[PDB]
Amino acid sequence: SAVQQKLAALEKSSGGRLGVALIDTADNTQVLYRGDERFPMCSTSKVMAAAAVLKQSETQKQLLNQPVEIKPADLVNYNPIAEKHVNGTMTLAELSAAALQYSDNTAMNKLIAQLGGPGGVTAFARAIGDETFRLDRTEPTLNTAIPGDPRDTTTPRAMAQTLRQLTLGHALGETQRAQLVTWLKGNTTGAASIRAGLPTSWTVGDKTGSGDYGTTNDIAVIWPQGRAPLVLVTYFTQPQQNAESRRDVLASAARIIAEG
Ligand SMILES: CCN1CCN(C(=O)N[C@@H](C(=O)N[C@H](C(=O)O)[C@@H]2N[C@@H](C(=O)O)C(C)(C)S2)c2ccccc2)C(=O)C1=O
């Protein structure tokens, strides 16, 4: 179609590999570009870890208030929030918000530990019907983004469907779903990605991701004005290991989709 020709031209101009999935919940139509190819998730995987903890809190009602100790040994390469609490505690709610809104890598590792390892995060995906998502490693090695490596990957189609279920569907309880939406809407790292290609009046909740091989990702739920919400996943990776991030590509992909 028209949108797919423009996305293909965008990809060609960028020198990388672009994957897009859009779900328009108004009629459940989909727009896919490389929708069934695997891409490295990098920090977009944090949404699944936070959601898995939220699902646990449907039974363990006070779980989000559980204090978790932050020790110097827990700190990894990027810990903007956890660093402020070393030798103190953060609750699981606070770690979830830090993982989602600041992309804190120590917070992600604490969430993974709460779930019993990367196997526990992947298990949650399977339980809500996502057979594609796989989390294999912890932070920071899950961001190596090596071409062809299936570890820590998903496909655009699978992530779009799963993000729809978590935020607009009923994979989580009502209180848990509302908390996830609130967290995504308060993301602080997304201003130059999907959001930058969309009308300023639209409300967006997103989670970015970046890694080696110039990997630049963003996944978002979009609430347009007076119109059904959309789910948009944009994944981008490049042939050179130390390639620079290309958030402009994600913005341009969103702009092309929003033109439809
Ligand atoms: C060999 C192990 N190894 C290989 C790959 N790797 C990374 O990919 N780290 C990445 C990382 O730690 N990214 C962080 C993360 O994993 O939420 C944050 N998420 C990004 C985002 O949401 O867009 C960020 C730019 C807000 S930093 C990284 C990407 C670009 C620039 C600096 C760091 C590492 O640093 C690393 O330890």
Residue 142 Cα, ligand 1 centroid: separation in angstroms? 9
Say which amino acid occupies 61.
K
Residue 77 Cα, ligand 1 centroid: separation in angstroms? 8
Distance CA 97, CA 242 (A): 29
- The residue contributing the CA closest to ligand 1 atom 33 is 211
Report the top-level CATH class of 2-41+116-259.
alpha beta
Dihedral of CA 1/154/189/14: which sign? negative
Among 48, 135, 141, 143, residue to substitute to test ligand 1 (most atoms within 8 Å of Cβ): 143
Write the CB contacts of 137 (distance below 8 Å, at least 6 apart in sequence): 118, 151, 152
Residues classed as catalytic: 43
Resolution, in Å, please?
Answer: 1.7
Cβ-based burial of 202 (10 A; exposed 0-12, middle 13-18, buried ≥19) = middle
For tokens 């490389």, name the residue: 34
Q: What is the DSSP letter of 175?
A: H
Cβ-based burial of 143 (10 A; exposed 0-12, middle 13-18, buried ≥19) = buried
Q: What is the DSSP letter of 110?
A: H
Full 3-state SS string of 135-162: CCCCCCHHHCCCCCCCCCEECHHHHHHH
Q: Structure solved using which method?
A: X-ray
User: In 59-200, where do the E strands start and end?
Assistant: 67-70, 88-91, 153-154
CA 193 to ligand 1: nearest atom: 23
Are 125 and 48 in contact by the 8 Å Cβ rule? The answer is yes
Number of neighbours of residue 6 by Cβ within 10 angstroms = 18
Distance CA 206, CA 47 (A): 9
Distance CA 35, CA 40 (A): 13
Residues with CB under 6 A from ligand 1: 42-43, 77-78, 103, 105, 139-141, 143-144, 189, 208-212
- Beta strand 17-24 with 153-154 is unpaired
Write the CB contacts of 175 (distance below 8 Å, at least 6 apart in sequence): none
CA 245 to ligand 1: nearest atom: 30
The DSSP H or E segment spanning 24 is strand 17-24
Are 180 and 162 in contact by the 8 Å Cβ rule? The answer is no
Residue-wise over 183-195: b if at least 16 C-beta within 10 A, else e?
Answer: bbeebebbebbbb
Distance CA 207, CA 189 (A): 8
Residue 209 Cα, ligand 1 centroid: separation in angstroms? 8
Nearest residue to 64 (alpha-carbon basis) of 77, 50, 75, 76: 50
Write the CB contacts of 60 (distance below 8 Å, at least 6 apart in sequence): none
The encoded tokens of residue 250 equal: 């994600």
The encoded tokens of residue 179 equal: 């908390």
Cis preceding linkage at 199, omega within 30 = no
Distance CA 107, CA 47 (A): 12
Number of neighbours of residue 60 by Cβ within 10 angstroms = 11
Are 198 and 252 in contact by the 8 Å Cβ rule? The answer is no
Nearest residue to 194 (alpha-carbon basis) of 154, 156, 167, 222: 222
Residue 206 Cα, ligand 1 centroid: separation in angstroms? 17
The shares of helix, strand and coil residues in the chain, as percent rounded to the nearest 5, are 45, 20, 35
Can you say how many angstroms the Cα of residue 231 is from the centroid of all Cα atoms in its chain?
12
Distance CA 21, CA 32 (A): 5
